[PDB]
RNA sequence: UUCACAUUGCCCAAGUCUU
RNA sequence: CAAUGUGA
């Protein structure tokens, strides 16, 4: 239940392709380095303050200690050669513009043992060793640049990327030390994030309040101006030599604001006559004291990342400033590494480390896509080309016959007229007839409505009046709270199928849009759009098997009380195509799925009810777990799956395959040959697979870019097998995973992650919609909100 | 709320110390 | 999913 399986073999399927990865080979010396535990009293200091302390400490004691050590900003210091210490704590006293620093040797870290672990010699990779190398590579940039996670950001020289609102774009790069089949690798990728400009607060006001210049005007701000400004600068730090954090903007101008007025105080003591006394002051420091700074004598301090959400316009600017095709990104990574010059870094060089300046070459394989079987009389077979196919002259494998349906238009009648609805209905019936999902009649019901209050009574009337009602098509004017209400009533209250459509897609229809629309409708009504060509599937389908997709979605940044949402879906046929969903609310920002055992039990029960088979195997696709959570998550969740089986029957012990899916990492793959690049974005082809060189030295993992890259640089999904009772070969599991990317019903394309994992996202996001403005007695309220109706339980409402 | 892809938002990481 | 783009 605890240790991941070794790599069974290497894949052999598919034609080869020359790739370049943003991994850079590291040459590590085979010598012991020396680990020391520090202490710094007081120890509530920010991490960067601790780096200053040790930095000054190193030189302020250079003489009979420290004859170029590295430091993690907390508690760990490393040297390439040993110090004079013994094992003794050597408390030092250091002063920086009153600190006690204790230095104690702890262990010897052998880089020799790392070479063995990267080889077949040692069974596993020693974390503490890679942890040390990480501190070596991060030492310099952690003081030179502004750390954000595993990245480093800085104001770009000579350029300025303003966002407005006192914000601008800082470019940066991600850095991480990784073991691999070949060598140690330095993974480098470029990135960009928003920062507040280091400008006078006076000019910060102008951008926030949209003033061309101050003295526009010379009257104290309106309360509406003062409230907007207070929201932006509160929590931000400002400087004079001495730095404060802003907690409040005073109501009264500096001329009147008394504590002795602020204006007066600065006239006598500091001999400063304020140029804009009519403006308020910044209350800084402790909220329960009376320290007020005029705007004129304050600057926003540099290197403060913008945590708040960007505006629509700010986002739009951010996108344009950082959007890059795959070759363009490739060159920006390359240019960065040449200019980075990691080998002159004195700390990197103290530890005798060398970093390759060229991207690593890696050979991938482009897997063949599966054939997609359709229905109708002809039973057409689609052949994905470059990750895409279409439904033209093809009918659904199992198309639904729609006899009873209705339209509910919440768009204004002037904007969405009966003629519009009629034409839309005309075209939709045409497309749906072609697709093998005939809408036999005009809707038995069609009424306009307004507001969220009209939803439930209308839907209740519909359910009571029209027997055999299959669907309600809901027209929406755009972004409106009605949508969430439609889904609350439909999914959870009354248990009725609904398909919403934006007004603009009714006024002006297209064959493609209407086609995609039918894909959702047919699925929602129990249909089967298409299936994998049966004889083209991997051998695993010879026995009953269920495919589980699982994901947790956490609240946005800055949020503190909203629940995390766990969603799990399971296949309900042998194709596989039909899926049922389970969903739960759980603790804030907890990744481990707490109630998984219960959820899997439901899915296993519903699988048997649907197929009359008991799975002999369980394939578990787990999205979004990082390497630092593999053991924790696997321990709880693998056992939870077993628990579900055991509490059901026997002696029922199906083989479990546990696979972690990671779409969001920092590995990027590029075509070496320009003639391999695909489309305008110039990305690697769909099906590109990498399970060598850059992958894990001992464990079963691979990259699979299963989708066509439309824009930017494609994210190759990474798959890591944490458990496998079924003993998959690399070829079978990679093909299986790839084929499951072709079973996503909402489009005739290969998607970036397997359908079950994708559905899990959709289910989680739907639950989040049921919880809008609603997020023991607390838990049960939220739990009921995400609980769907009895009639919705076995449906694909999430489509 | 036709859909995918891409950027950010999500576990780990990161962050958090005389007017 | 939301914002913003590229696309069908
Ligand atoms: Mg997740
Ligand atoms: Mg943490
Ligand atoms: Mg969007």
Tab-separated table of C-alpha atoms in Angstrom, chain A residues 568-762:
chain	number	residue	atom	x	y	z
A	568	UNK	CA	-15.093	11.065	-8.464
A	569	UNK	CA	-16.588	9.536	-11.615
A	570	UNK	CA	-16.771	5.925	-12.781
A	571	UNK	CA	-17.419	4.264	-16.136
A	572	UNK	CA	-20.730	2.406	-16.485
A	573	UNK	CA	-20.165	0.353	-19.646
A	574	UNK	CA	-17.455	-1.585	-21.501
A	575	UNK	CA	-16.916	0.912	-24.329
A	576	UNK	CA	-16.111	2.938	-22.164
A	577	UNK	CA	-18.485	5.895	-22.601
A	578	UNK	CA	-21.200	6.357	-19.968
A	579	UNK	CA	-20.073	7.751	-16.609
A	580	UNK	CA	-21.737	8.376	-13.248
A	581	UNK	CA	-20.533	10.941	-10.736
A	582	UNK	CA	-20.084	11.342	-7.005
A	583	UNK	CA	-19.164	14.583	-5.275
A	584	UNK	CA	-18.454	15.819	-1.755
A	585	UNK	CA	-17.476	18.971	0.088
A	586	UNK	CA	-14.503	18.642	2.423
A	587	UNK	CA	-11.997	20.571	4.524
A	588	UNK	CA	-10.569	23.860	3.269
A	589	UNK	CA	-7.576	23.209	0.993
A	590	UNK	CA	-7.316	19.476	1.746
A	591	UNK	CA	-6.100	17.469	-1.246
A	592	UNK	CA	-6.785	14.003	0.198
A	593	UNK	CA	-10.286	12.831	-0.712
A	594	UNK	CA	-11.786	12.196	2.701
A	595	UNK	CA	-14.957	10.262	1.823
A	596	UNK	CA	-13.480	8.325	-1.118
A	597	UNK	CA	-14.396	4.861	0.196
A	598	UNK	CA	-18.066	5.826	0.278
A	599	UNK	CA	-17.858	7.370	-3.199
A	600	UNK	CA	-16.172	4.363	-4.833
A	601	UNK	CA	-18.702	2.022	-3.199
A	602	UNK	CA	-21.550	3.942	-4.858
A	603	UNK	CA	-19.802	3.769	-8.212
A	604	UNK	CA	-19.068	0.040	-7.933
A	605	UNK	CA	-22.709	-0.608	-7.046
A	606	UNK	CA	-23.942	1.450	-9.988
A	607	UNK	CA	-21.431	-0.276	-12.266
A	608	UNK	CA	-22.875	-3.683	-11.411
A	609	UNK	CA	-26.428	-2.380	-11.795
A	610	UNK	CA	-25.519	-1.131	-15.276
A	611	UNK	CA	-23.258	-3.904	-16.592
A	612	UNK	CA	-24.176	-6.845	-14.344
A	613	UNK	CA	-20.420	-7.335	-14.018
A	614	UNK	CA	-18.151	-6.923	-11.018
A	615	UNK	CA	-14.888	-5.222	-12.028
A	616	UNK	CA	-11.837	-7.483	-11.927
A	617	UNK	CA	-9.683	-4.359	-12.171
A	618	UNK	CA	-9.943	-0.720	-11.084
A	619	UNK	CA	-8.064	1.944	-13.053
A	620	UNK	CA	-7.835	5.074	-10.900
A	621	UNK	CA	-6.851	8.339	-12.608
A	622	UNK	CA	-6.047	10.886	-9.886
A	623	UNK	CA	-5.664	14.491	-11.047
A	624	UNK	CA	-3.608	17.234	-9.448
A	625	UNK	CA	-1.375	15.585	-6.846
A	626	UNK	CA	2.188	16.888	-6.613
A	627	UNK	CA	5.211	14.679	-5.908
A	628	UNK	CA	5.415	15.948	-2.331
A	629	UNK	CA	1.973	14.465	-1.651
A	630	UNK	CA	2.310	11.098	-3.422
A	631	UNK	CA	2.850	8.997	-0.293
A	632	UNK	CA	0.270	10.812	1.846
A	633	UNK	CA	-2.472	10.678	-0.789
A	634	UNK	CA	-1.717	7.122	-1.935
A	635	UNK	CA	-1.829	5.856	1.657
A	636	UNK	CA	-5.321	7.159	2.372
A	637	UNK	CA	-6.893	6.770	-1.067
A	638	UNK	CA	-5.516	3.376	-2.122
A	639	UNK	CA	-6.702	1.942	1.197
A	640	UNK	CA	-10.032	3.723	0.758
A	641	UNK	CA	-10.562	1.961	-2.569
A	642	UNK	CA	-9.738	-1.402	-0.993
A	643	UNK	CA	-12.069	-0.591	1.896
A	644	UNK	CA	-14.909	0.036	-0.551
A	645	UNK	CA	-14.317	-3.370	-2.148
A	646	UNK	CA	-13.954	-5.247	1.138
A	647	UNK	CA	-17.112	-3.763	2.681
A	648	UNK	CA	-19.053	-4.750	-0.390
A	649	UNK	CA	-18.309	-8.408	-0.700
A	650	UNK	CA	-16.002	-11.288	-0.102
A	651	UNK	CA	-12.973	-11.429	-0.695
A	652	UNK	CA	-13.568	-9.076	-3.564
A	653	UNK	CA	-10.061	-7.895	-4.383
A	654	UNK	CA	-9.882	-6.333	-7.860
A	655	UNK	CA	-6.491	-5.208	-9.126
A	656	UNK	CA	-6.006	-1.504	-8.494
A	657	UNK	CA	-3.951	0.728	-10.776
A	658	UNK	CA	-3.312	4.126	-9.192
A	659	UNK	CA	-2.237	6.844	-11.624
A	660	UNK	CA	-1.559	10.482	-10.752
A	661	UNK	CA	-2.289	12.915	-13.589
A	662	UNK	CA	-0.394	16.214	-13.597
A	663	UNK	CA	-1.293	18.742	-16.281
A	664	UNK	CA	0.311	21.653	-14.452
A	665	UNK	CA	4.048	21.128	-14.123
A	666	UNK	CA	7.035	22.921	-15.698
A	667	UNK	CA	8.115	20.370	-18.302
A	668	UNK	CA	7.797	21.582	-21.894
A	669	UNK	CA	8.630	19.596	-25.028
A	670	UNK	CA	9.547	21.055	-28.414
A	671	UNK	CA	10.115	19.735	-31.922
A	672	UNK	CA	13.798	19.618	-32.813
A	673	UNK	CA	12.983	19.664	-36.530
A	674	UNK	CA	10.967	22.599	-37.857
A	675	UNK	CA	9.165	20.238	-40.253
A	676	UNK	CA	7.628	18.396	-37.275
A	677	UNK	CA	6.003	21.484	-35.740
A	678	UNK	CA	2.211	21.525	-36.055
A	679	UNK	CA	0.057	24.511	-36.956
A	680	UNK	CA	0.434	28.200	-36.135
A	681	UNK	CA	1.547	27.486	-32.561
A	682	UNK	CA	4.214	25.087	-33.834
A	683	UNK	CA	3.593	22.499	-31.125
A	684	UNK	CA	4.489	18.820	-30.950
A	685	UNK	CA	1.893	16.482	-32.488
A	686	UNK	CA	-0.928	14.901	-30.494
A	687	UNK	CA	0.133	11.487	-29.191
A	688	UNK	CA	3.736	12.480	-28.488
A	689	UNK	CA	5.006	10.225	-25.691
A	690	UNK	CA	8.170	10.458	-23.581
A	691	UNK	CA	9.143	7.781	-21.057
A	692	UNK	CA	12.941	8.036	-21.244
A	693	UNK	CA	15.884	10.257	-20.288
A	694	UNK	CA	13.908	13.000	-18.496
A	695	UNK	CA	11.553	10.689	-16.599
A	696	UNK	CA	11.990	9.078	-13.179
A	697	UNK	CA	15.137	6.914	-12.690
A	698	UNK	CA	13.362	3.906	-11.105
A	699	UNK	CA	9.599	4.495	-11.116
A	700	UNK	CA	6.795	4.065	-13.640
A	701	UNK	CA	6.053	7.469	-15.190
A	702	UNK	CA	5.676	9.069	-18.620
A	703	UNK	CA	4.704	12.253	-20.453
A	704	UNK	CA	1.841	12.073	-22.936
A	705	UNK	CA	0.723	15.060	-24.976
A	706	UNK	CA	-2.588	13.693	-26.190
A	707	UNK	CA	-4.049	16.899	-27.605
A	708	UNK	CA	-3.519	19.170	-30.587
A	709	UNK	CA	-1.856	22.408	-29.530
A	710	UNK	CA	-3.963	25.274	-30.839
A	711	UNK	CA	-2.235	28.226	-29.203
A	712	UNK	CA	0.793	28.884	-27.021
A	713	UNK	CA	2.924	25.981	-25.822
A	714	UNK	CA	1.167	22.679	-25.123
A	715	UNK	CA	1.290	21.252	-21.603
A	716	UNK	CA	2.299	17.601	-21.922
A	717	UNK	CA	0.319	15.752	-19.255
A	718	UNK	CA	2.503	13.720	-16.899
A	719	UNK	CA	1.340	10.340	-15.588
A	720	UNK	CA	2.844	8.661	-12.534
A	721	UNK	CA	1.855	5.124	-11.521
A	722	UNK	CA	1.801	4.964	-7.709
A	723	UNK	CA	0.315	1.459	-7.574
A	724	UNK	CA	-0.431	-1.290	-10.102
A	725	UNK	CA	-1.774	-4.712	-9.086
A	726	UNK	CA	-2.493	-5.323	-12.768
A	727	UNK	CA	1.142	-5.210	-13.910
A	728	UNK	CA	0.646	-3.015	-16.977
A	729	UNK	CA	3.443	-2.793	-19.509
A	730	UNK	CA	4.525	0.706	-20.531
A	731	UNK	CA	2.978	0.184	-23.968
A	732	UNK	CA	-0.454	-0.957	-22.786
A	733	UNK	CA	-0.903	1.737	-20.135
A	734	UNK	CA	0.311	4.516	-22.439
A	735	UNK	CA	-2.006	3.400	-25.238
A	736	UNK	CA	-4.869	2.896	-22.792
A	737	UNK	CA	-4.359	6.393	-21.375
A	738	UNK	CA	-4.150	7.854	-24.872
A	739	UNK	CA	-7.300	6.078	-26.037
A	740	UNK	CA	-9.229	7.337	-23.002
A	741	UNK	CA	-8.425	10.863	-24.198
A	742	UNK	CA	-10.558	10.041	-27.264
A	743	UNK	CA	-13.683	9.133	-25.265
A	744	UNK	CA	-14.496	12.702	-24.194
A	745	UNK	CA	-18.071	13.239	-25.350
A	746	UNK	CA	-18.202	17.056	-25.496
A	747	UNK	CA	-16.066	17.252	-28.649
A	748	UNK	CA	-14.672	15.267	-31.567
A	749	UNK	CA	-11.103	15.889	-30.418
A	750	UNK	CA	-8.444	14.203	-28.321
A	751	UNK	CA	-8.273	16.073	-25.008
A	752	UNK	CA	-5.260	16.753	-22.788
A	753	UNK	CA	-6.273	14.372	-19.970
A	754	UNK	CA	-8.340	11.142	-19.888
A	755	UNK	CA	-12.121	11.559	-20.067
A	756	UNK	CA	-12.753	10.251	-16.535
A	757	UNK	CA	-10.326	12.803	-15.053
A	758	UNK	CA	-11.823	15.536	-17.230
A	759	UNK	CA	-15.365	14.685	-16.133
A	760	UNK	CA	-14.138	14.867	-12.541
A	761	UNK	CA	-13.214	18.502	-13.140
A	762	UNK	CA	-16.626	19.207	-14.658
